Amino acid sequence: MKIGVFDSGVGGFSVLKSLLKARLFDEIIYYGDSARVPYGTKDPTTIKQFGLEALDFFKPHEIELLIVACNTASALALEEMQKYSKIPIVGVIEPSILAIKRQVEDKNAPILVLGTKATIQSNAYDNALKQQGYLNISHLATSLFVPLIEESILEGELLETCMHYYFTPLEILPEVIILGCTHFPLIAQKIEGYFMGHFALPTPPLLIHSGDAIVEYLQQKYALFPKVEFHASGDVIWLERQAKEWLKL
Amino acid sequence: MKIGVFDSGVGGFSVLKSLLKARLFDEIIYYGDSARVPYGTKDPTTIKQFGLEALDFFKPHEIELLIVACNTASALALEEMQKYSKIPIVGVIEPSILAIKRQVEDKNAPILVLGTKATIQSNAYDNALKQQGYLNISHLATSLFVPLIEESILEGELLETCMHYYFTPLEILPEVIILGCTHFPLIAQKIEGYFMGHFALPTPPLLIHSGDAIVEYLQQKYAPKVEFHASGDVIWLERQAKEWLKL
Numbered sequence A: 001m002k003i004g005v006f007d008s009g010v011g012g013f014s015v016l017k018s019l020l021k022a023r024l025f026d027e028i029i030y031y032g033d034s035a036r037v038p039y040g041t042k043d044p045t046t047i048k049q050f051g052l053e054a055l056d057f058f059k060p061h062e063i064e065l066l067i068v069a070c071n072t073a074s075a076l077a078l079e080e081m082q083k084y085s086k087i088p089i090v091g092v093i094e095p096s097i098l099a100i101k102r103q104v105e106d107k108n109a110p111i112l113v114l115g116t117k118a119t120i121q122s123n124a125y126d127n128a129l130k131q132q133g134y135l136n137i138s139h140l141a142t143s144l145f146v147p148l149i150e151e152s153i154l155e156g157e158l159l160e161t162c163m164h165y166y167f168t169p170l171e172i173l174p175e176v177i178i179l180g181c182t183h184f185p186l187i188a189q190k191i192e193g194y195f196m197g198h199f200a201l202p203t204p205p206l207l208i209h210s211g212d213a214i215v216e217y218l219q220q221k222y223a224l225f226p227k228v229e230f231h232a233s234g235d236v237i238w239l240e241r242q243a244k245e246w247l248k249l
Numbered sequence B: 001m002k003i004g005v006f007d008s009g010v011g012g013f014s015v016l017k018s019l020l021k022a023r024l025f026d027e028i029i030y031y032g033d034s035a036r037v038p039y040g041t042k043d044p045t046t047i048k049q050f051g052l053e054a055l056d057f058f059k060p061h062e063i064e065l066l067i068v069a070c071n072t073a074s075a076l077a078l079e080e081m082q083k084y085s086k087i088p089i090v091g092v093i094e095p096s097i098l099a100i101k102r103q104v105e106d107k108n109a110p111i112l113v114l115g116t117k118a119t120i121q122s123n124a125y126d127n128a129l130k131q132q133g134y135l136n137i138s139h140l141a142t143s144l145f146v147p148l149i150e151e152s153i154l155e156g157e158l159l160e161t162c163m164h165y166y167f168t169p170l171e172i173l174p175e176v177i178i179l180g181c182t183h184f185p186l187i188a189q190k191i192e193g194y195f196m197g198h199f200a201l202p203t204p205p206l207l208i209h210s211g212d213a214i215v216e217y218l219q220q221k222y223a224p225k226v227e228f229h230a231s232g233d234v235i236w237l238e239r240q241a242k243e244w245l246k247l
């Protein structure tokens, strides 16, 4: 097929990478609203309007299916968007819950949800999880991880001090951690390392990657080479430059 | 005297606070583009457009003077705005340079400019400083300071470690530090302490507060009902003001 991938900026590249890795589609129209990014710190009303406007961007491209790669957008604007689209719009939250259900049998396993303040406050992960029968659910808005990852601070004392800042107030010891944000996969190993150490874990907690989850899901739902076209709200060449580092083979 | 104050979001309150205090105005229409903030990490073209669209917002409020409280906008779109503008537009850069000439005679004094990537990248401060004679100039895009302050990390090891991340590479020990960003005034005390405690400096480096600087300048040119506006939830924005303006 020919699809569109939407995100607030360059975070969506973590989804795009999984999409390319799988060779699921022949044409992908990537669009990042890099001029208004980030969404996670904004309000619900606003993100919803951004959502609608994103649809308008794809009207001329005529895609068969739109993937809302942004977790913040999937959480607060996927419904309204789907409500005005003729084509199917798949967010990243839904696929992750299927991913969890498929590999976590113990309904008591401690699950920690990570994401932006907007994502967390919408409680989209918690509701979908509870509905599926999970009883031990925690959530944390790790805002600073986004700007940190964007400055490319993927190691060192600043990241460690930042992770320590958000994690220390943690009560539960998670067996599952949801990277409910486009950025978090770039520091997934650092997060695993933090919990493995601070809790003398034998193995790292299971990490749920949004990109990998959507892919599996898309292969499932549509029993399934890769040519991308980049579009941005802000300087597009600036965005294309990021793809190089994020998508890194 | 009715004036509009423009900023990327809530950082502009630090200029507002310096304004209100001086009280030389009887009406201020504050407009923060909170839905698109920050400007500091974006490109010149986008920022120029944003600044232009900001004018389209004060047309109705019919203000006499427009203060661009944002250092990034000042650096990247002031010229463009002043061009298509009917009324005078004063940014926060030039006033900070006049305040520097006025307070620093040693044209060799080590000067460090701190601002967003865009502000630093534009060389607005280095250029203006050089046309005035200074030869000891250094600049640092201390990007993360904005999101940290936005999240109120104004103390603690996270802030401390961030300052260390940006400052340790610093070649010259600054005698003058320019808070070339609306958020930096909130960690001024902490920034002074850093170098002070890090080099046993009895006296803290001189810090230039953009807000104060534009006030002194506005004092010479000689020219309160504050009205908050925003591109994002106006509720969330004004709430913030309570803390920034808080005194």
Ligand SMILES: N[C@H](CCC(=O)O)C(=O)O
Binding pocket: A007, A008, A009, A011, A012, A037, A038, A039, A040, A041, A069, A070, A071, A072, A073, A115, A116, A119, A146, A180, A181, A182, A183
């Ligand atoms: N794309 C957002 C992170 C960046 C932003 O806040 O816009 C998400 O996945 O939640």
Ligand SMILES: N[C@H](CCC(=O)O)C(=O)O
Binding pocket: B007, B008, B009, B011, B012, B037, B038, B039, B040, B041, B069, B070, B071, B072, B073, B115, B116, B119, B146, B180, B181, B182, B183
């Ligand atoms: N107001 C901006 C900082 C925040 C932003 O980047 O929008 C400045 O003074 O540079």
